[PDB]
Scaffold this active site. Structure first.
Site, PDB file in Angstrom:
ATOM      1  N   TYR A 509       0.936  -1.114   0.000  1.00  0.00           N
ATOM      2  CA  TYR A 509       0.000   0.000   0.000  1.00  0.00           C
ATOM      3  C   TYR A 509       0.982   1.169   0.000  1.00  0.00           C
ATOM      4  O   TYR A 509       1.188   1.816  -1.024  1.00  0.00           O
ATOM      5  CB  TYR A 509      -0.915   0.005   1.230  1.00  0.00           C
ATOM      6  N   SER A 592      -5.318   0.766  -4.954  1.00  0.00           N
ATOM      7  CA  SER A 592      -5.312   2.217  -4.691  1.00  0.00           C
ATOM      8  C   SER A 592      -3.875   2.751  -4.715  1.00  0.00           C
ATOM      9  O   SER A 592      -3.198   2.628  -5.722  1.00  0.00           O
ATOM     10  CB  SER A 592      -5.960   2.472  -3.316  1.00  0.00           C
ATOM     11  N   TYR A 593      -3.415   3.342  -3.614  1.00  0.00           N
ATOM     12  CA  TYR A 593      -2.041   3.834  -3.546  1.00  0.00           C
ATOM     13  C   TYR A 593      -1.145   2.632  -3.783  1.00  0.00           C
ATOM     14  O   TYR A 593      -0.037   2.760  -4.312  1.00  0.00           O
ATOM     15  CB  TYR A 593      -1.722   4.423  -2.162  1.00  0.00           C
ATOM     16  N   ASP A 670     -15.573   4.148 -10.787  1.00  0.00           N
ATOM     17  CA  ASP A 670     -14.740   4.588  -9.676  1.00  0.00           C
ATOM     18  C   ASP A 670     -14.777   6.122  -9.654  1.00  0.00           C
ATOM     19  O   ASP A 670     -14.185   6.781 -10.512  1.00  0.00           O
ATOM     20  CB  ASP A 670     -13.299   4.102  -9.884  1.00  0.00           C
ATOM     21  N   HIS A 702     -14.326   2.340  -6.475  1.00  0.00           N
ATOM     22  CA  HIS A 702     -13.009   2.091  -5.911  1.00  0.00           C
ATOM     23  C   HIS A 702     -12.896   0.842  -5.040  1.00  0.00           C
ATOM     24  O   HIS A 702     -11.807   0.269  -4.906  1.00  0.00           O
ATOM     25  CB  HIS A 702     -12.540   3.292  -5.100  1.00  0.00           C
TER      26      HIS A 702
HETATM   27  C1  LIG Z   1      -7.676   8.686   8.306  1.00  0.00           C
HETATM   28  C2  LIG Z   1      -8.388  10.003   7.950  1.00  0.00           C
HETATM   29  O1  LIG Z   1      -8.689  10.756   8.870  1.00  0.00           O
HETATM   30  N1  LIG Z   1      -8.663  10.302   6.640  1.00  0.00           N
HETATM   31  C3  LIG Z   1      -9.356  11.600   6.437  1.00  0.00           C
HETATM   32  C4  LIG Z   1      -8.338   9.467   5.456  1.00  0.00           C
HETATM   33  C5  LIG Z   1      -7.679  10.295   4.326  1.00  0.00           C
HETATM   34  C6  LIG Z   1      -7.357   9.404   3.134  1.00  0.00           C
HETATM   35  C7  LIG Z   1      -8.626   8.668   2.610  1.00  0.00           C
HETATM   36  C8  LIG Z   1      -8.305   7.762   1.367  1.00  0.00           C
HETATM   37  C9  LIG Z   1      -7.127   6.759   1.635  1.00  0.00           C
HETATM   38  C10 LIG Z   1      -7.952   8.618   0.090  1.00  0.00           C
HETATM   39  N2  LIG Z   1      -8.704   9.459  -0.021  1.00  0.00           N
HETATM   40  C11 LIG Z   1      -8.034   7.705  -1.187  1.00  0.00           C
HETATM   41  O2  LIG Z   1      -9.056   7.062  -1.421  1.00  0.00           O
HETATM   42  N3  LIG Z   1      -6.925   7.595  -1.982  1.00  0.00           N
HETATM   43  C12 LIG Z   1      -6.854   6.885  -3.302  1.00  0.00           C
HETATM   44  C13 LIG Z   1      -5.626   7.548  -3.915  1.00  0.00           C
HETATM   45  C14 LIG Z   1      -4.707   7.788  -2.737  1.00  0.00           C
HETATM   46  F1  LIG Z   1      -4.097   6.581  -2.384  1.00  0.00           F
HETATM   47  C15 LIG Z   1      -5.653   8.162  -1.631  1.00  0.00           C
HETATM   48  C16 LIG Z   1      -9.266   7.829   3.761  1.00  0.00           C
HETATM   49  C17 LIG Z   1      -9.590   8.693   5.000  1.00  0.00           C
END
Ligand SMILES: CC(=O)N(C)[C@H]1CC[C@H]([C@H](C)[C@H](N)C(=O)N2CC[C@H](F)C2)CC1
Ligand SMILES: *[C@@H]1O[C@H](CO)[C@@H](O[C@@H]2O[C@H](CO)[C@@H](O)[C@H](O)[C@H]2NC(C)=O)[C@H](O)[C@H]1NC(C)=O
Ligand SMILES: *[C@@H]1O[C@H](CO)[C@@H](O[C@@H]2O[C@H](CO)[C@@H](O)[C@H](O)[C@H]2NC(C)=O)[C@H](O)[C@H]1NC(C)=O
Ligand SMILES: *[C@@H]1O[C@H](CO)[C@@H](O[C@@H]2O[C@H](CO)[C@@H](O)[C@H](O)[C@H]2NC(C)=O)[C@H](O)[C@H]1NC(C)=O
Ligand SMILES: *[C@@H]1O[C@H](CO)[C@@H](O[C@@H]2O[C@H](CO)[C@@H](O)[C@H](O)[C@H]2NC(C)=O)[C@H](O)[C@H]1NC(C)=O
Ligand SMILES: *[C@@H]1O[C@H](CO)[C@@H](O[C@@H]2O[C@H](CO)[C@@H](O)[C@H](O)[C@H]2NC(C)=O)[C@H](O)[C@H]1NC(C)=O
Ligand SMILES: *[C@@H]1O[C@H](CO)[C@@H](O[C@@H]2O[C@H](CO)[C@@H](O)[C@H](O)[C@H]2NC(C)=O)[C@H](O)[C@H]1NC(C)=O
Ligand SMILES: *[C@@H]1O[C@H](CO)[C@@H](O[C@H]2O[C@H](CO)[C@@H](O)[C@H](O)[C@H]2NC(C)=O)[C@H](O)[C@H]1NC(C)=O
Ligand SMILES: *[C@@H]1O[C@H](CO)[C@@H](O[C@H]2O[C@H](CO)[C@@H](O)[C@H](O)[C@H]2NC(C)=O)[C@H](O)[C@H]1NC(C)=O
Ligand SMILES: *[C@H]1O[C@H](CO)[C@@H](O[C@@H]2O[C@H](CO)[C@@H](O)[C@H](O)[C@H]2NC(C)=O)[C@H](O)[C@H]1NC(C)=O
Ligand SMILES: CC(=O)N(C)[C@H]1CC[C@H]([C@H](C)[C@H](N)C(=O)N2CC[C@H](F)C2)CC1
Ligand SMILES: *[C@@H]1O[C@H](CO)[C@@H](O)[C@H](O)[C@H]1NC(C)=O
Ligand SMILES: *[C@@H]1O[C@H](CO)[C@@H](O)[C@H](O)[C@H]1NC(C)=O
Ligand SMILES: *[C@@H]1O[C@H](CO)[C@@H](O)[C@H](O)[C@H]1NC(C)=O
Ligand SMILES: *[C@@H]1O[C@H](CO)[C@@H](O)[C@H](O)[C@H]1NC(C)=O
Ligand SMILES: *[C@@H]1O[C@H](CO)[C@@H](O)[C@H](O)[C@H]1NC(C)=O
Ligand SMILES: *[C@@H]1O[C@H](CO)[C@@H](O)[C@H](O)[C@H]1NC(C)=O
Ligand code: NA
Lengths: 728, 728
Positions: A509, A592-593, A670, A702
């Site tokens: 990840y 994802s990431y 997505d 997603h």
């Molecule tokens: C823990 C917390 O407080 N927060 C606000 C998180 C901030 C990142 C969010 C995702 C991981 C991201 N938005 C995503 O979907 N990506 C896809 C592309 C990239 F990897 C990030 C999940 C909640």
């Protein structure tokens, strides 16, 4: 010969994990669902009663998705016609059932297609959002008071977040906040007028002749962001004036100079609210503490109560500035901030003094503050045994900080090293949730003496079933690189033998503040791969990962697509050097990431990996949203960080993909990481003559979590991994 | 020992077929582009002169896409800035070069982004369409006259066709028809106001941050169709002071009673024009013959000169009513129509006589009328040796129909069995283009005594190169099914050994009136499959195929996805019984209609096929356009043919795909068979738990012909077929 943990076992959920989800409804009673029945439990003795018979709503004519009991126990909110939207948002229909009269209310019903509804924190007041406008009901069966008239689909959002605020900032769809006793209702207003729209097709059922074009305000990196405004309305005056006045609280001058965000709202007392703002360049945030002025009916935030929080090494907060926890009188608060050494710890603040006092410290971090009483502050941290991947509940005495007791560390150190907690209303009781490394265990505890009251769920049933199965084992350890420790875990096949060479799958990840090496117990795809296919599934937390200090987390600041990618490669090397890895069969995959990093690695030309799978990957940062992307990469302009934005794309590495076997997968609907990101990867590969495998999932987002797609994608990925590893 | 025809040879065009494309400019001469020069040839002696130097435009500054010399040879239209749209449509920029004063015209030049331009049939007038409006220029350097002012992007089309009329009716973007001497300019106007739009994403280059949404007025089966009107304008009486006047010619009442289409426009003489109209239910068409009236200045179409053409067994014509061929005076004409036995032959019509007389007959069909003089009518038919897949040029004496003479049959029977022809202005000369079974041979002939003047191109260079290659052979034959013979062809591997077992790939198209079994010489993917992989590639023409009469072609009327699918399975079943076919290795593949049949076959449950590949297939008829679909399926309403529309889908057969390997491919920017069609197939397979292979091609349309995608798709399909067959 005991059977192994197969793919079907994973996809069909044959070995089911049990949990114990309760809802505190007071300081000593909680609700628990048992056989469609809703029981109420007395925390202190464990005795219960039927609160709401499962046959109560048989002839409702609708399937009830969820329920919500008003704080005073007099009414129950019934949710149905649930229609999912994004990660947190959805629309639904609602009915209110009067518990006393035991009748269902049929007058002045909540509108169908309600976007959000919430009871006031006390009593039974209701606030809800419909057609992007806020409404309030003082009594379940009386007319609603309209609060806003500006509501406008995809343009003006009152009391609810737009797409980016929902996903990246509040992790919620709601954007309204009741004051402690329910007198005041605060809310945010988002304006997306100039925000560009992401557009993609949604095919729906076979019967739809023409495909539908979904359109959603979504600010990509460097694009026009939505603007926001904050207001507070006094609901107690609603039945006295024709149109109650929403008083606005404007952002500080330091934020008004440019683009900014409202990133936190927290009430301190009945007449004091705190707000944190963040500059579009997320390394500077300001917290205002505002008091109600009874004579002017206005809200004022004294600059002497303003608190500034910035960062020189990275952004502010793990994913955003932390929330404050106020003491009852609202004159002081506790907040997690990173110290001079770069470790996140609890800082105690006087509301009108800028310098705070750290009450915890050390080379470890506080994960979150869980409860606060006049005498103790309870928190979760990874201090125990110096394991950043562990989590334990701690109690610190407010009159003497040298007095810190770990309430969970020693309960069952061998079976439980990753805890979560749920306190009752006044923290009189707390439920502990152990999620690993052994089978989850849920227990109830008394706060007055910290004694264990009883086990709620120990998963004995599953323990018995797993006895006849050749389950894999998990190894959590670390390797040293540059005098710094970096953790990893390995899901090892049963009867693992260090004298043999096993094929290895690197599960990655690796996004900022991520952690793939922990003590959590999981039954997933990697379980099957280790148990049945005898594959070693490994994960590494390198530079950029979290809970280990800012030196490691901010290492990728403004440099996504570098160090976290390289360390993942180095991790594979280190692993092969352990001697039980078939250097010829090393794969990598992520979602994802994880898909981005997997892709970047497969295209680095390292020669280390044979094949890899990227699911819904990001391919170029300019395609992702502004709030998340800019936090780590700044702005994509020549005056800021455009060069690195253009230098960290997957596409520019297309040519190196001739060296590996690649499987690219993406859901067509997505809304988060647009299908566009994979459409550009594939086009780039076709352009340089590279062959690869691909799979699209019609109308999946997603998560690709629909029952059928989920089974389909993991089945498809299993064939690809078995094939790359030459496995029968 | 010698090489084989490899996949790279096909993809890189190592072996190129030489052609000879000429342009008749009179009854005695033609233009031929050589060395990037334009030469004019004298047909009688073969001598030539340079007409335009390749270096003449050396300093033009633009890459010239194509050229067009005015009929009188005085001017040349230079086309550049070519931007492709659909199958025939495109926009371009133009400049005119005066051949007399050897100078490029710079005054009053054609606008940029011009949609269509064309010289008058005689002289040098011009007519062009820009921004959906029609313009005329009497002289190249003079200001053009505006003919229409209602032009509106995606709504009102003047002089050009909308998406459906371009693809399905006229096979052209142009909707302009100059009278024989250029006096009158007839045009059609299309109104797509209520035509729904097909919408899909276009990603473009990596630099585009937000995907673009393409919107195209495209009527699916049963949807609202565009409306059409017909006009004729006198270009000899245009004024720069007054707006040109267009005279309308309304369609007959039998057409106005409901939805209908304009399907043919053919000038008979300088003052007579004919038009054919077709009802939305495509089994009834009407030809109107209209004469200009100098008194009123109107166009009258006498009911006595009205001709009806209907069908009781299917639709009218092969893909629409055939075009008429008027005699010099325009009082009578020839038209191909199916006779009482169901075979298409030439019928002779008197313009004011209801009954026509057939001048040819027999169990074979006339393919097209090619040239007409007062003494002879020249046509192409598949009569020779009773081979429906062969084509030859014949002439029939108009004064004695018993005297039919074949002009190409005997020229070279071993090498040539498939001809097309090109006659000069008054049919004084004709060019024969042989394209099979041997290498293409181009020859020139004189009509007076049918002398073979000379060989223009015999492809001897290619013949010399192919000698050092192990080329496959082609077998053309037939099998019987219920006393009816159906033809098939097999591309056999080099040194075919009937005592061995070869894997077999069924290459299928099978759309209505199609033909995949012919005598044409081709160098394509199948050539490589047979020459290098030793795979037999077969094709079969079953019920629904053309050129063999209505009994065969109309068998699938109102029933697509039935007999044409079953017959492919029957053919394969029969091929498996042959001694040289390995019944364990039989595959099938198709593109477009062939993707549909291939998919319907794989989901048939027949057990005959091991694997198959479908490229841009139709998945359910309601997703395809109205003009083509309704022609064969009627309307998708319960009163008409909805039940068959519903059970002729690929999706309904998902479950049957469990026992086969399937590869599904489709370009995301397909404006013809929308990606939607495959998106619904993949979703249905996912829904029943069937694993399969897929590949989308970003921004490619129905042809997937950009250089990189073309190479990639065939490479990817080759790996799939070789793997299905266990081939090294
Ligand atoms: C823990 C917390 O407080 N927060 C606000 C998180 C901030 C990142 C969010 C995702 C991981 C991201 N938005 C995503 O979907 N990506 C896809 C592309 C990239 F990897 C990030 C999940 C909640
Ligand atoms: C759990 O048990 C307690 C005590 O057993 C219940 O308390 C009741 O308290 C009232 C006080 O007015 C007594 O009159 C009742 O007789 C008590 N019940 C019993 C069984 O002793 C309490 O109500 C129970 N709670 C639940 C949810 O069952
Ligand atoms: C949302 O923000 C937009 C600005 O993008 C506001 O729209 C402007 O409103 C002013 C005042 O009426 C007009 O003069 C401008 O023409 C508008 N600009 C645009 C781009 O439309 C809008 O009023 C805001 N809405 C609310 C409720 O605050
Ligand atoms: C309730 O009060 C609000 C605020 O005064 C009213 O909103 C204004 O409405 C007028 C006219 O409809 C607009 O010109 C203003 O731009 C609005 N201001 C805001 C902040 O929305 C609202 O219309 C009132 N509702 C009623 C029923 O009187
Ligand atoms: C909730 O808190 C509000 C704010 O303090 C209370 O409202 C105030 O009540 C006092 C009386 O104690 C009045 O003098 C003020 O005028 C009120 N202020 C406002 C803004 O309304 C309210 O009484 C509290 N509610 C409960 C149930 O205690
Ligand atoms: C093309 O044909 C038209 C129609 O036959 C010719 O125009 C007519 O010419 C005669 C003789 O000059 C006039 O008396 C008529 O009034 C014209 N009719 C119309 C409708 O214009 C025209 O001359 C021919 N053009 C060429 C180049 O031969
Ligand atoms: C042209 O084809 C249509 C469609 O089959 C025929 O119209 C009717 O179609 C319905 C639907 O099957 C039948 O129930 C009727 O018997 C058909 N006839 C009529 C008059 O409605 C139509 O007959 C065909 N026209 C010709 C000349 O064959
Ligand atoms: C082809 O050859 C003929 C001669 O056989 C050329 O000659 C004819 O036309 C010339 C000009 O166009 C004249 O100079 C000749 O007098 C004339 N002769 C005859 C018998 O017609 C003819 O031009 C040549 N054509 C081409 C295209 O080069
Ligand atoms: C093109 O077709 C439209 C649709 O029939 C014509 O306008 C008609 O439809 C409009 C909207 O559906 C109605 O509001 C109009 O009353 C109706 N008629 C007219 C005259 O507008 C439109 O006129 C056509 N345009 C042309 C140039 O023929
Ligand atoms: C269509 O566009 C072309 C290109 O812009 C026009 O050609 C000239 O292009 C130059 C630059 O290449 C400009 O400076 C001129 O303004 C353009 N016009 C002229 C007369 O030179 C061309 O003129 C355009 N066509 C029409 C009909 O306007
Ligand atoms: C020969 C002739 O005169 N005409 C007008 C033809 C009519 C069918 C056209 C396509 C073959 C079709 N439009 C298509 O692309 N399909 C895709 C789906 C189905 F197979 C048909 C090609 C021209
Ligand atoms: C509650 O309802 C469920 C589902 O209808 C049923 O299984 C159960 O028996 C009911 N409760 C009790 C105590 O029987
Ligand atoms: C919600 O929709 C249902 C179904 O159409 C309708 O009968 C009901 O009256 C609606 N309720 C409200 C509050 O509008
Ligand atoms: C905030 O980040 C920007 C961008 O790197 C930087 O220029 C500025 O100095 C930073 N401010 C602080 C306090 O670090
Ligand atoms: C015209 O240019 C081509 C190359 O584009 C060249 O091969 C040819 O020799 C030129 N024609 C003449 C007559 O030289
Ligand atoms: C020609 O007709 C158009 C269409 O309404 C009009 O706008 C234009 O001014 C007219 N020109 C003349 C000279 O009548
Ligand atoms: C004749 O053969 C056809 C297929 O060619 C078949 O469908 C039909 O049932 C057979 N019998 C008759 C009487 O047509
Ligand atoms: Na000759």
């Amino acid at each position: 010969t005991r059977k192994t943990y197969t793919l079907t076992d994973y996809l069909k959920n044959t070995y089911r994990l049990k949990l114990y989800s309760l809802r505190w409804i007071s300081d000593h009673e909680y609700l628990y669902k048992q056989e469609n029945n809703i029981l109420v439990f007395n925390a202190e003795y464990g005795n219960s009663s039927v609160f709401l018979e499962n046959s109560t709503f048989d002839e409702f004519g609708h399937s009830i998705n969820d329920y919500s009991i008003s704080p005073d126990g007099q009414f129950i909110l019934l949710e149905y016609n649930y229609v999912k939207q994004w990660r947190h948002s959805y629309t639904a229909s609602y009915d209110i059932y009067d518990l006393n009269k035991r009748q269902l209310i049929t007058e002045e019903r909540i509108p169908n297609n309600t976007q959000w509804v919430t009871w006031s924190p006390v009593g039974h007041k209701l606030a809800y959002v419909w057609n992007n406008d806020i409404y309030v009901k003082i009594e379940p069966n009386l007319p609603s008071y309209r609060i806003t008239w500006t509501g406008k689909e995809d343009i003006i959002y009152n009391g609810i977040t737009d797409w980016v605020y929902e996903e990246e900032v509040f992790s919620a769809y709601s954007a309204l906040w009741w004051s402690p006793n329910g007198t005041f209702l605060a809310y945010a207003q988002f304006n997306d007028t100039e925000v560009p729209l992401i557009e993609y097709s949604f095919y729906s059922d076979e019967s739809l002749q023409y495909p539908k074009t979904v359109r959603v305000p979504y600010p990509k990196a460097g694009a026009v962001n939505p603007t926001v405004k904050f207001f507070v309305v006094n609901t107690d005056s609603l039945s006295s004036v024709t149109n109650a006045t929403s008083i606005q609280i404007t952002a500080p001058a330091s934020m008004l100079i440019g683009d900014h965000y409202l990133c936190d709202v927290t009430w301190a007392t009945q007449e004091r609210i705190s707000l944190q703002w963040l500059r579009r360049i997320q390394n500077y945030s300001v917290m205002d503490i505002c008091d109600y002025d009874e004579s002017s009916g206005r809200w004022n935030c004294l600059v002497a109560r303003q608190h500034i929080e910035m960062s020189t090494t990275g952004w502010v907060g793990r994913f955003r500035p932390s929330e404050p926890h106020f003491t009852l009188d609202g004159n002081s608060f506790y907040k997690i901030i990173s110290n001079e050494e770069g470790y996140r710890h609890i800082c105690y603040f006087q509301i009108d003094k800028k310098d705070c006092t750290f009450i915890t410290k050390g080379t470890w971090e506080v994960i979150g503050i869980e409860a606060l009483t006049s005498d103790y502050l309870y928190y979760i941290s990874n201090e125990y045994k110096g394991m950043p991947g562990g989590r334990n509940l701690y109690k610190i005495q407010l009159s003497d900080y040298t007095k810190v007791t770990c309430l969970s560390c020693e309960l069952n150190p061998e079976r439980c090293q990753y805890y979560s907690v749920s306190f009752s209303k006044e923290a009189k009781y707390y439920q502990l949730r152990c999620s690993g490394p052994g089978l989850p265990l849920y227990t109830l505890h008394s706060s007055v003496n910290d004694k264990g009251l009883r086990v709620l769920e120990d998963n004995s049933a599953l323990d018995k079933m797993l006895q006849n199965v050749q389950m894999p084992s998990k190894k959590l350890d670390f390797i040293i690189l540059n005098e710094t420790k970096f953790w990893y875990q390995m899901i090892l096949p049963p009867h693992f033998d260090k004298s043999k060479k096993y094929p290895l799958l690197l599960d990655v990840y690796a996004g900022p503040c991520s952690q793939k090496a922990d003590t959590v117990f999981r039954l997933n795809w990697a379980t099957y791969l280790a148990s049945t296919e005898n594959i070693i599934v490994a994960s590494f937390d390198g530079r950029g990962s979290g809970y280990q200090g800012d030196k490691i987390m901010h290492a990728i600041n403004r440099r996504l697509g570098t160090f976290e990618v390289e360390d993942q490669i180095e991790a594979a090397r280190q692993f092969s050097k352990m001697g039980f890895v078939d250097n010829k069969r090393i794969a990598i995959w992520g979602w994802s990431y994880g898909g981005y990093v997997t892709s970047m690695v497969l295209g680095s030309g390292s020669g280390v990996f044979k094949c890899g799978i990227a699911v819904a990957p990001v391919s170029r940062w300019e395609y992702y949203d502004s709030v998340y992307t800019e936090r780590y990469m700044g702005l994509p302009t020549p005056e800021d960080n455009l060069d690195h934005y253009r230098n960290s794309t997957v596409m520019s590495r297309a040519e190196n993909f001739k060296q590996v076997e690649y499987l690219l997968i993406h859901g067509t609907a997505d809304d988060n990481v647009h299908f566009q990101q994979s459409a550009q990867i594939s086009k780039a590969l076709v352009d340089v003559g590279v062959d690869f495998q691909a799979m699209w999932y019609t109308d999946e987002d997603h998560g690709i979590a629909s029952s059928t797609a989920h089974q389909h994608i993991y089945t498809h990925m299993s064939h690809f991994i078995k094939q790359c590893f030459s496995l029968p």
